[PDB]
Paper text:
Family [name] esterases present similarities to class C β‐lactamases, which show nucleophilic serines located at the S‐X‐X‐K motif instead of the G‐X‐S‐X‐G or G‐D‐S‐(L) motif shown by other carboxylesterase families. Indeed, the analysis of the substrate specificity revealed its capacity to hydrolyse nitrocefin as a model chromogenic cephalosporin substrate (40.4 ± 11.4 units·g−1), and a large battery of 66 structurally different esters (up to 1730 min−1), including bis(2‐hydroxyethyl)‐terephthalate (241.7 ± 8.5 units·g−1) and the mycotoxin T‐2 (1220 ± 52 units·g−1). It also showed acyltransferase activity through the synthesis of benzyl 3‐oxobutanoate (40.4 ± 11.4 units·g−1) from benzyl alcohol and vinyl acetoacetate.
Structural analyses of free and substrate‐bound forms of this homooctamer [name] suggest that EH7 presents a more opened and exposed S1 site having no steric hindrance for the entrance of substrates to the active site, more flexible R1, R2 and R3 regions allowing for the binding of a wide spectrum of substrates into the active site, and small residues in the conserved motif Y‐X‐X containing the catalytic Tyr enabling the entrance of large substrates. These unique structural elements in combination with docking experiments allowed us to gain valuable insights into the substrate specificity of this [name] and possible others belonging to family [name].
Residue numbers in the entry:
A (entry chain H), B (entry chain G), C (entry chain E), D (entry chain F): 8 to 409
E (entry chain C): 90 to 196
The structure:
């Protein structure tokens, strides 16, 4: 009976047993870094398998990962820091800060560049951006003529892509729907990044470093991996049929190793388990860690609320693959998902459980009812491939023994 | 880190920084007085800019302001003091106390003085007056033939206007709707004033002074500004295009300096930040301050409930500009607004947050979940012009650090 | 500052001031006995005016009153004592215990004795009787051909009326509606009385005396007023136009002084303020007073729940004068009304506030949120005449000062 | 101290008085074993009447009973132990673990073996099995052509019946409805048994013994009654009209005494009151008893939630005799019923009250609001016959005196 | 109607002024019946179609037809039309005119 903070460590050992038996030994994932904490105390930390298969290098605690969309909560906090200085209000039109967006219209029909559009019921608000109710979309969605336009203009990334270019190009594109009336995962968070720059006078990497990473002691989180740390950078793998994987990004000669001009508020960051733990633990503590504060306790409680109309779940409003059964009983606040109904989600957990993931199968959650949190790192695109984040939840909630 | 009552004072300093940067330095407001308190302790008090631009006089803590519609909560408390003595019941017809109102009818069509009307489903009740569900209106609404009548009869104020005249004139006017069936901001609170007089035997200035202002130590709150205090009286300014302002009321030769015969339960009062703080803090304490009680703890808890049908928000029942997005997730009790849904309001705060404002951009709130309150004084007509009350909420809730 | 149990006694003195000014001095009521208690402590007890106008006798604390329908909670407790011994279940058909009621049918049309009827969806249950969803009615309702039948058969009372006769006569009468589908105030509680007899083997006066009155020290509560105590018995008065009253029952030569054979579970009891206080205080304590228990804490919590379908209020299901505005936001359990929505009721009080009244303007309530209770005795038929029970609530809740 | 753990033992004595008066003396039941516990303390334990009428043998505390469907919670816990090791997820298709079930279809019309079927909206999930939303059924339901097929194939039990045979036969049978769209009591739990075997590598009797019975000190719980304990085994009786009973299973020469090849996760177990108390008390403690843990506290809290769509009760989704009035205000989790609305159920108790029963009138419940639990053993088929489980609840909740 | 002597949508109280303030039965027994305001006055078309809210003594369903029977408004000694009209002026209607149908003395 090893018990720390009401958690049986013997039960937590099933994490490593499970990742070995189900993913690593059968060659579905290259390697995992898994951290669990409760009541401020780290109770599990376990590197397993390889960060680089080709170079036979193991995952270590200090291994760097593409956290991709786990950037979105950091960008969300950055912008909400400025909400707390009265620099904007959530119900303000975006076109107040981006005047060229005043006349954005809703897609009716046509192909880029001759798309016909209709008037929106109301202009897009900052709250719409923070909650993906903008009516913006993502190139990779591959559902509509609008995301076809995003792909032909490389608005997800590509040579000479800047935030200045994203904002300039989106001014001339239609929205998937009248702002507020639906939910669709979007570049909206990359735009929030642009608004941090606009309001702070700083470049996004500088705002993050000054106002989040330095205060919290996150020295290994950056848009561009410094040359001296590139040895610690994991390879990224993508799914291959037969539950296998292939090389997707070599850490040597990775775009993440160059400073191209694109600071992606949506997917740009590289981090390690320790750095993301400090960010998570700060949020779990109401915005403060070791005497550094990144956000007001109340402002954070506001971000963790469901901001979807009529306390609806994602499938009640989502047009995308976030319509599907895994997101049942989950809502969405200002940059986090929020568990609304545990039974409906078919996954053990608590009402209020908040977090997000990255397209490379990175995941984190904060159960505010249990003061419990997990950070899970691996590099397998896409995150939709395996239900590993759900198995980990089963095991972890399984290890509660008070 | 200065922390008083779980509030970072360094974070509260963003209030002054914000009002300077956004309103004062750019010449949108003349001057501000801002007070914040929590758990009985004043944690912020800051005069800024000028009370009188023309005479180059600064705002001081003791500066007197037209609080306009922040009178309504005081008139509400006055009447509810009499509820507690069994002097009436909320479900009683108004025409019990004002017999000439027995045959009030609902506007169908026509112009003053030949307006056709229909029978109401039921007579107007006291609760209707206290909640603006009377079907009365305001001259300044400028929406209907009925408020056109209010303007031609100067029922908002003007030469030889008394409450006796308001009551006499309203007896011959139609209502905007069958009482209870909708909400419309109204002279109803001026009528509550008349009912305080009717039931107490006292003139409203005397009831207020005896039963509210003296007990609470509010020596600088009155319908008429005494000659010896007129030096402290701020000028009132109105909005001019280009986010500028012009002189609206000179404190020397102001109708607020004369005792004309009109005691406005709806907008009549002049007060200072300290006096309104004592009134607010009394409410925050459940009706008692420094051993003086103006209202029962339970009676007040009743006034702070949502009194709108089916726990609806103002936009679900309001016919006016209180229909609009800023009042989403806000209800209405007996003289206070009540926050119902924080996420829906798109503004940080707590469920139960109650208060009201004045047309000159004066505002106060009491967050009963956080034991937190704000009093904000400025003189810019109309209150709808800037979202300053929302920015202050963002910053203040931002400064909570427990 | 006299304060007992968080109640300002100076504020409670407004009770006597109010009853004098509004009812006694203007000759609307003959006399009042008013008791208030909180946290087990009696904080107000006040006789006022006359128990007998004709004989110029004052109301004293020991004065006996017709509590009429305040019997119903006592009969409810009696039956639920037997629920706790497993003697029946609430969802059981009544015709299990009263076999002659197996074929009760619903009124379609016609006059007694040729009434046509329809099959009910389901048989009447014990829970239907305890909640007035039986589809039974009362002679005095004066709305339907069915209550016309009750009057011609004198089922409310009259010479040689017994419970045995009520049960025998109701077997041959139609119901106002299919049991469960509506609410209508009824002899159902008189029938509950009959079921106490049926299941206990005892006459109702004996069950009450043995299992309620003796345990609780209620020596002055009985269906028949002993000759020796008839000096203490108040006269009953009925309303006369001009807000006046006339003699309705002379205490000398009162049917309440004779032992006719009718033990009315619905309206039969005579009691004093002290006895009803002990009954009320027992309920307020979870069924125990001074080491005597009349009901389990849990069983009582069950009786105080709203037992109306879909947590509806009385006006959502009532066909009677309990449809009207005063009963808005009030439900009904097993013999008590239950406040559901305070704001909707337009009267100060707490969610869960339970109690009932008698047709002679007797009233009691228990606010379980405030551990507060009131017993009000007067003798003015009918209870619908004046809103005094609401004025008392205003004043009493007004006197809470913690 | 006639009070243990806030329960009056004098009031609990009404249990024996009631079972004697209502069931035993009138010969409706042969014998009862009744245990009640609160806050970890057993406050009532009472054998009454005979375990074997023919052999005139009394019920003793150590008497063994057919608990029938009270097996289902044990099988549920067994499977959820494996959920906690990440061995599966609730939203996974069953056909992942039982590939021959990929093409299960929904009954349209026809008789076995020529039944026509339609495509289901989605494949059956593990959660569907644990909640009886599978669309599987039971032979004994006697409502549909589908259960007629179950009977002709003896899928409830009979010679040469194994779990391997149940799974093989169900692969070729239609479902009553598209999985998830309704509720119907089923062999689904017997299938959960098969999945425990599939995932654990162990036979179900071994998994139970190793992972539940040995840890909890339940030496007298087994699928097959050991020869040396067969003297303690009660006879089973079935209902006969006139509220009488006949011999149904002689304990000598009982199929429960032989090891036929059928390990019934649904109804197979024989147990005693002490063993089932230890299992119940473990659950009441959050999955731990005397330092042995069978399930995580959080995992169990998940199983006790209502898992029916839109927090509906059983009658809102059940097609069976679980449609009927007794199951009003009761939902269903992963192997337990859950009380949702106390008033609606017409039975005293608490929201969250969970448990289940056996077809032989065995019953248990755990009131997590009162830390109270009951185990009731008798042998009368079917459980639907008498409302004894409701009478016991009335009496027990009646005995709460804090 | 064909001589233009009236219109169907005209209030009855135009031709029977004592009927201007007819009210709808809420509760009570003759002679102390409580009533509510009708949405609109009774029209001639209401009479011709039995949507008046009048009733018949013999209906034997409501306190209102009990009143018709005790006043013998279906017939009986010294009954005239003048008496029917005079007595109905002081009685409540079963419902707000137009809102339902009930066979009646309307004809
Ligand atoms: P982000 O990683 C998309 C980043 C921009 C990519 C441009 C090509 O979204 C991934 C979705 C994962 C959400 C939750 C997944 C649980 C592990
Ligand atoms: P009151 O100030 C109107 C007073 C009577 C004026 C007669 C000409 O209403 C102003 C509305 C402000 C409500 C909330 C505003 C937030 C600052
Ligand atoms: P009970 O007094 C009727 C007793 C049977 C009378 C048979 C002629 O009902 C009276 C209704 C009062 C309920 C609440 C009133 C508040 C004071
Ligand atoms: P289980 O006992 C059916 C076991 C399989 C038998 C195959 C012939 O279900 C019985 C239903 C009882 C549920 C609740 C009853 C309360 C005592």
């Amino acid at each position: 009976s090893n018990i720390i903070a009401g958690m049986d460590l013997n039960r937590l050992d099933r994490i490593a047993e499970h990742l070995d038996r189900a993913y690593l030994h059968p060659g579905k994932l290259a390697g995992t870094m898994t951290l669990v904490a409760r009541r401020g105390e780290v109770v599990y930390c376990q590197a397993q398998g390889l960060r680089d298969v080709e170079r036979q290098l193991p995952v270590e605690r200090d291994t760097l990962f593409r956290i991709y969309s786990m950037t979105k909560p950091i960008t969300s906090i950055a912008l909400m820091q400025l909400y707390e200085q009265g620099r904007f209000l959530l119900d303000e039109p975006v076109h107040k800060y981006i005047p060229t967006w005043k006349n954005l219209r809703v897609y009716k029909t046509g192909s880029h560049p001759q798309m016909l559009t209709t008037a929106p019921q109301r202009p897009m608000t900052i709250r719409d951006l923070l909650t993906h109710q903008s009516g913006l979309t993502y190139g990779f969605m591959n559902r509509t003529n609008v995301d076809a336009a995003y792909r032909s203009l490389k608005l997800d990334g590509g040579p000479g892509h800047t935030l200045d270019r994203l904002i300039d190009e989106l001014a001339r594109l239609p929205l998937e729907f009248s702002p507020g009336t639906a939910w669709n995962y979007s570049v909206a968070t990359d735009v929030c990044g642009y608004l941090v720059q606009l309001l702070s006078g700083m470049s996004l990497d500088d705002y993050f470093s000054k106002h989040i990473f330095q205060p919290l002691g996150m020295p290994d989180t950056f848009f561009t991996v410094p040359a001296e740390k590139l040895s610690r950078f994991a390879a990224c793998y993508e799914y291959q049929p037969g539950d296998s994987f292939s090389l997707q990004d070599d850490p040597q000669g990775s775009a993440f190793a160059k400073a191209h001009g694109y600071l992606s508020g949506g997917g740009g960051l590289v981090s390690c388990v320790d750095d993301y733990y400090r960010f998570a633990q700060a949020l779990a503590n109401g915005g403060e860690l070791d005497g550094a504060r990144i956000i007001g306790r109340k402002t954070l409680e506001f971000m963790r609320m469901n901001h979807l109309p009529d306390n609806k779940g994602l499938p009640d409003v989502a047009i995308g693959s976030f319509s599907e059964t895994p997101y049942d009983g989950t809502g969405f606040g200002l940059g986090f998902s929020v568990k609304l109904d545990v039974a409906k989600s078919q996954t053990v957990g608590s009402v209020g459980e908040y977090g997000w993931g990255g397209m490379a199968s990175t995941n984190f959650f904060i159960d505010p009812e249990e003061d419990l949190l997990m950070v899970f790192m691996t590099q397998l695109i896409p995150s939709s491939t395996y239900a590993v984040r759900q198995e980990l939840r089963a095991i972890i909630n399984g290890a509660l023994v008070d």
